[model samples]
Target: KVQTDPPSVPICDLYPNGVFPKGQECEYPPTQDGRTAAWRTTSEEKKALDQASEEIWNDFREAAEAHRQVRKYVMSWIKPGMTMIEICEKLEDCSRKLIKENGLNAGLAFPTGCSLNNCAAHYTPNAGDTTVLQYDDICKIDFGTHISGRIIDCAFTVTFNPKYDTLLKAVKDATNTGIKCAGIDVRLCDVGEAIQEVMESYEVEIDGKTYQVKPIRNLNGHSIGQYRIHAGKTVPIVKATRMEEGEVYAIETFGSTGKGVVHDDMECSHYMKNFDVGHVPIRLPRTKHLLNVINENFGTLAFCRRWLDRLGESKYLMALKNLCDLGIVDPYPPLCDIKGSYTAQFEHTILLRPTCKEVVSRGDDY
Candidate 1:
């Protein structure tokens, strides 16, 4: 629920501003008469904005390549007697190290695993843990990282054995459908409808049910620019309505192992370690501390978890507790859950132009 000025400005413009500084914890300000402020980015700002966007893409590619190589190495370590935790830890460490080395500006997507069948949760490996990698399990890895002021997101999955040829093809087909539909000048509703068409067209069966691949109900790919990673503007994965040009979006498709719908983890929120970009408003108590820290330490990209951990333990961690109570911020839910839900995600960042749409992160298929 956001307001409009000329009734045309993007709703995200009304989000809480000056809450995050260069290197500190984000602070919520006090609300005044139930009103909020909106900040606009100028043409010059757009120039820097585009630069930041490209930087995020560069970082995303690097992180994805790092995951690809690490996955290869980790696969070899997944022989009998090795636990999922052990493998997951190794993968996470490897990805974090690679991101740092490449100077990529975002944090690693938490945990790892193949969210197939009834097994859908963040998978991590512990030293003493032991779980065999079963051939029947089709694993999916979804990860995200930020760079500059933009965010690059991607995911890929593989099967232990070779029986999933059809599943793989079907999922890819679904992904392609979503990608193809992105090129259209449809509305956000159409995006979801398009995804539905792809999923329905196949009518592939998993378990005793038809592939009930549900469009992630709570989650939708978004329009990202400036400093927002999971920008508020959601471009639905399934087509239900039509979208327009000038809209930048990430069309993501999720294949279900069971029921089409997925739920968010209320237990934990991944807070990102971020630096405030020098827009601290007066009237917030922790503003000085958060702002100073961000200036000193906030990196190019950050995650949501680190941001939450900053405020210490509070109701805000679960709900919009801190920011909302402080009257400075309102309720804004996480784009996706961080626990227990195993989801396979495929995404592409797109833009609507005058004549046609542009896919920024589209990789050339060999």
Candidate 2:
């Protein structure tokens, strides 16, 4: 009896009487200890992959349409009058309803509403989270759905006040620079260098201090597909990370209008509820329950983080939470001096090819 009303997703019903069969329920591959591995598609898988990719594009288009459909909803009911939690809740409800009704298919690699804001961890709101749109602050939306595993990750930001115009332009310009830099055939270092170049191009004044663009620390755009969301291959939009080809990515750009690097306060808590390490170690009850529910119903992975706060007291739990926090540990990329402020972001989905990279989410309108 899986829920099947407005947000109903009949998990077993979709498969029907063990239709997936033994071993057909894809097993989670043994992720490389800490690092990630590249997965190549087989010929049959590639054909399925292409078909799924097309479907996902359509779904992406659909979700964008839905965004437009609900824009009015946000504008009318989700302003300063509402709470952030309320605004987000309404948006999620609308999105969930639409997704269920359409049975929209995403690529093998895409997740529904997999969005993150400035320095915020990759997350989607649960039943209870912030919904009210902030007026004077910067709001970023990053979401996409996959059809059979092909993924589309798109991100954009809106500022409530005119003072952020400079910040907006800086992010937009840096984003375009990233798109151009991605188009060429180059190594990962080249991509980082290019991003670094774009960030270095600007200098802004804040609190009597001046700072230029700084690439997002520890966060890298990744190759899509093969089940894992952030499949390790990184395409850094700033001067520091690595990049490579035969990979898909969400090349995003972020820069502070003030001095220092931007960091996020964790807003969502994703938990691993259920999993078997194959005779290695069974998942804890808490983890197993949460993971099972999300994966069983959503057909996706779940990583949780504490919003805007440091990790909890437990060292192990904190370490696990950091992954969702985008690996933010101090000294590697200081999250201070840049604390107490807002950051702007812009992102585009990238498809790296043999000769060039393509911005899958780009259009003349935007």
Candidate 3:
């Protein structure tokens, strides 16, 4: 069995009645190696250390723990006969329970991305999706957990056939290479170059035909912020600016056996309010009501139509379309490569701590 950290407890257990008790707060263990003990936990000593606020760091730890625990269960049950929506629901239900999801606090960072086969990203099962998994399908299971906004964004690829092992290996190795290259003040472009070099090094043989794994050129990872999945910095797989101290990033990579670029396809299910648009007048009644639900429940966090299906009362398609047309909500469609091609993805979230970088989402199984 793959070794993993201990399971994470529910948010309610961590904070009885919505507050961390004073005596049982997160306190770093004293170093036995007799290293510098300037570590500070008290609010009075908050300025003593340059690391991220310990409370926020504690939240990050909790999110990462929930992420690791849920993957261990979900990865084992995904089989060829399962439907996309079933897998999505199972994984999401597990996440909600582990994190003790409250309407506006701890819960999924975004919609669970269950992109299958040629689909590279942004694909999630809507209310009644009937797509089923097959033996040869390369399924990318990408999900996130967040505690009040500090998100642990990570993913892995699964397939029943062993023929595509190298495809999975290539992307995982590329992501680790990016993680190794990532650090405080490190050049982001250098990290991308390292990932590209590693990803292109592997070749896959399937059905007596040889294929080279190529980095998906257009897609890249990004830094995550409070209630925001995409912060400004872009961590490209084949390509960056720089990563600085105290920043959190999703170091993700995609390897494809088809064209190295992707085009948007299929129905749009993912969306978020266009922060740039701010608040504007809405003429449509349903659209106005839909916007209110979005604002209260999601409020800048990325959401999916499945969530709309769960939260809103009436038929919301036309209302959603109006929101998109007015530039009030930004829509994300499935990003796909050429038809008949296969793809794989792996990702991890790292924190550039003041003392050292921590791959907070790291687990033995990856």
Candidate 4:
């Protein structure tokens, strides 16, 4: 393949799913990898390349940098005494400040996920809920941040006890393998198999019994689309499909000490207004009002009860439930593994540029 300067992506009405929020700009500079550097920027080529790509790159990186820094402080500050809400609020607050959040221009990609122990994913606390972290608990801190509509979905696990070290290592290494295997036109199934192989290689001794760390079969990484997090495609932990050019993927993996499967359990907190609901008439007045609020502020982005609470919304449970019941919005339950077991997760988002793939969410500290 002749690598004569790479051709540029034509500017579209919306690039990679969402337009840059008007007047909002990327603070971090667009990355210059060796492959990209070769073609480099001739002023003519640069002009043809379109500034939108740079802005897009910048936005993803900016959000990722915010996540990287916030996770740093979070990992340092997190302890047994802290409540789940405390951790979640701190994550959002720090992310908002770091990115200088402005309406939909920049903010958290989704509600902060503070799933602990056998709870593998999607377990953010609702309003007034009090759950304290314990010294022996293994907590997965999965959160996201976005600038424009480019979201950086990354997560990590923290454990105060040394017994869970091997478990954390398994997930982290498997996640890295997934990220490594991802690229343009890469087979998602092969990547999943590789992740499974890496995860299952480690054995952790929990309570004096050896448990092989298994990849949670049902919970897998997914592509981040515009304001739509799940997008249409999923990168399964086992097997599924293939990746493509100019795509953003959250390559994550969960290592479990119990069955390698996860089940939907508990009250749902995460919800997203369906992106393509064609003007469904909302019955309840509050539902109509809530729909408008969601459309204006969140668009297709996911929200939680806590966010609604933050907006001073009370007595909205019925309205929210009605919206979900009507299929105008979708609700996600917390994914949990078997009890008395431990689970750990790690993730990073990748951007598959035409010339090469950028692990945009990568940082010094895993």
Candidate 5:
């Protein structure tokens, strides 16, 4: 059965060494100036609005630039017959190098994943995975970068199948529609309605039959904050709510040629610590050690077994399975597990303002 509990815990509880106040629900190593930050802005600093605005803009710009740089590099490297493991490792390495060279954080905001056709998301390859891309496979490259605790998430789809051309265009057009409708004080439902309307207008032919394109409604574009990927508000692909100004959101949409729903494939290669360290019951020293590695290395972000293996952890896979069995970590299953389904995704992070919206990851050709 799929677990429905939230994947995060209280910030103070997770990282007792951090500066968060008691009862604050935040991610570890919180930001220094935002809600996730450990310290509050003083009145004197608040009076220096011009300087603060410049600093914030610079931070966002740095993060956005890093994201675009890495995205361009990865897109150039992807091709048919490449192993998924190779893609993941190269993407992570390039992202880390860019972050260090830019004087930003040393780690990725999330793991690099190359989810192929019928595997919608969260399919990062294992350490020894030999899964290679086929000539006609539709591949989704998803990744993110961070400056300090600020993050910029984005993704795109690459395919060599001519049959999926219309399907891919539908998703990209729907994403553009959503972005166009997004702004300060705009209702999320209106945006969703617009995206859905556009997606539904397109149809794809398969095996001499035509299928109407549909959005995977369960997934949504979410607001981003310091040290957190999903910051609370969501932009649903279906009808939802109005959003406030000054919020950053990763607007993503998935268009599918099959039924819009996705199911778990009973295979998971990505996971994140879900509960407080004290809440999980431990029965083995190996499990304890693995948990320690996870907390110190990844905190709350998703990670794969390949990452742990590179750290020289012995029998890491068995320990990870134990943790999952004990409900200590949350597993991320592939979204497009259903067979014969063609899905395409397009995503970009944007900052919504009262008068206009800024697309942070805007350098890509899409």
Candidate 6:
């Protein structure tokens, strides 16, 4: 069994006044003591995988099974005209229930994103959001599950419209291609070449017009580690590292009818604490409390404005915004915010080995 002792120092001690001071640092408990904690383990602090360890592999399998269950439920439950907020809430609740019932960790690796049409990613609904799905809309539902902070991240696109069928297929095919090419000693650039080639080969025909499918180049798949969603290595769509044995990666691909590039929109509600940077002091006491709340609840995972809204703290909104501006937090903006662009995404988490790979988040349909 993994160790369960508390750290010698309180987490707050590592960050004075709820903020990490310059040059101060702490290791994730799991890496240091081989045990899970409420807080996330930093990517750098995460120990390399031991393929021989049954305990580590068991946690990976548990998280993967949880992801598959949630994916299956979401696919069956989603329908046209359902509100985005409803979908997010339902998926989150179902994930929580499944995790609890299965005796796994009780948290989401990331928010349940319902990025629609032109919005490529990071568009989880805020509290009381009135956005509803339409019959012709294309929606990307992305979510994850974790066990002892070992996470499985995956996403799939859904559309009721026939016009976007080819677009969706292109992304799915690209993602699968990326997955197939990933393994130890494989060049990351070669994987990108294969995904880009598959996506480029697809042409979407609409109203007697043919549009060449293109990938959103800026958004690439990433390696994953314990409690860290985006590890250092990236599997780029356009061009990019040799894969390492025992490393986990999330292979994500996006196919778009519009130009490949994506820009961040002004309307951003997703935020995560930046462990890489030192904290900037916020003069407000409420902001400090809100920061503490975030640390306790989310650790290093990305959270949205809706989560803070549930706290009913009067000044959380302003405080969060202030923290974002001060660079104490990193804000994730909505991707592919350009108008008239139709985008679809497919992602899967995989464990790379010397000669093969394990698709952790694979479901029957994927």
Off by over 4 Å in 3: 1-47, 50-52
Worst 10 residues of 2 by lDDT: 20-29
On TM-score, the candidate that comes out on top is: 3
Query: Residues 1-366, candidate 3, lDDT per residue (tens digit)?
Result: 222333335645655544422111222222435453335433344444544376776777778877877889887788988899889888888888778898768889889998988999999988778899999899998998898888889899988999998888889999988887776556778788989999999999977888889999899988988888888899888853768657888999999989989999998889998866777877688899999999888888889988877764669988989888988899999999999889899988877655556678888788
User: For every model shown, what is its TM-score relative to the native structure?
Assistant: 0.56, 0.61, 0.88, 0.86, 0.80, 0.82
| Alpha-carbon deviation at 120 in model 3, angstroms | 1.1
For candidate 2, give the lDDT: 0.46
Relative to the true structure, how large is the alpha-carbon lDDT of every model?
Answer: 0.45, 0.46, 0.81, 0.79, 0.71, 0.73
lDDT of 4 by residue, 1-366 (tens): 111111112112223353422211112122224232223223454344545476787788767767776888787789999999998987787777766677897787888999989898889999878899999998999888888888988899989989888888888999988887776556778789889989888988988899988899998888878887888778887753668766888899999988988899888889988888877766669989998888877888888889998888888888888898899889988999988888899998887654456788787898
Give the runs in model 4 whose Cα sits over 4 Å from its true position: 1-52
Off by over 4 Å in 2: 1-78, 97-133, 205-211, 240-246, 257-268, 271-288, 303-337, 353-357, 363-365
Instruction: Give the alpha carbon lDDT tens digit for every residue of 1-366 in model 5.
Output: 221122112222333443211111111122223333222223354235424454454455555665666777776768788888887877777667555523224357777867887777777887667889898888888887776666778889988768888989999999988887776556777778888999999988865779899898887888887767888788888753666756878889998877787787736787877634455656688888998888787776667778788889887778888888877787787777468887789998876532335676776376
For candidate 5, the TM-score is 0.80
Work out how many backbone clashes candidate 4 has. 0
Write model 2 residue lDDT over 67-137, tens digit each, in one string.
33333344445345465445554654554453333222432122223232243334444434554445565
TM-score of 6: 0.82
TM-score of 2: 0.61
Error of 3 at 307 (Å): 1.1
Which of candidates 4 and 5 reaches a greater lDDT?
4
Q: Is candidate 2 or candidate 4 better by lDDT?
A: 4
Q: How well does candidate 5 score on lDDT at residue 174?
A: 95
- Estimate, for each residue in 1-366, the C-alpha lDDT of model 6 and write its tens digit: 221122122222333343311111222122224444323233332333333444555566665665666777778779988999888878877676555422224467778878988889988877667888998888999888776777878899988779888888888999988886666566788889889999999989865678898988899999887778887898998663787766888899998887888888747768888766655555589888888788777777777887777657555778888778877788898887468778899998876532235676776778
**Which scores better on lDDT, 2 or 3?**
3
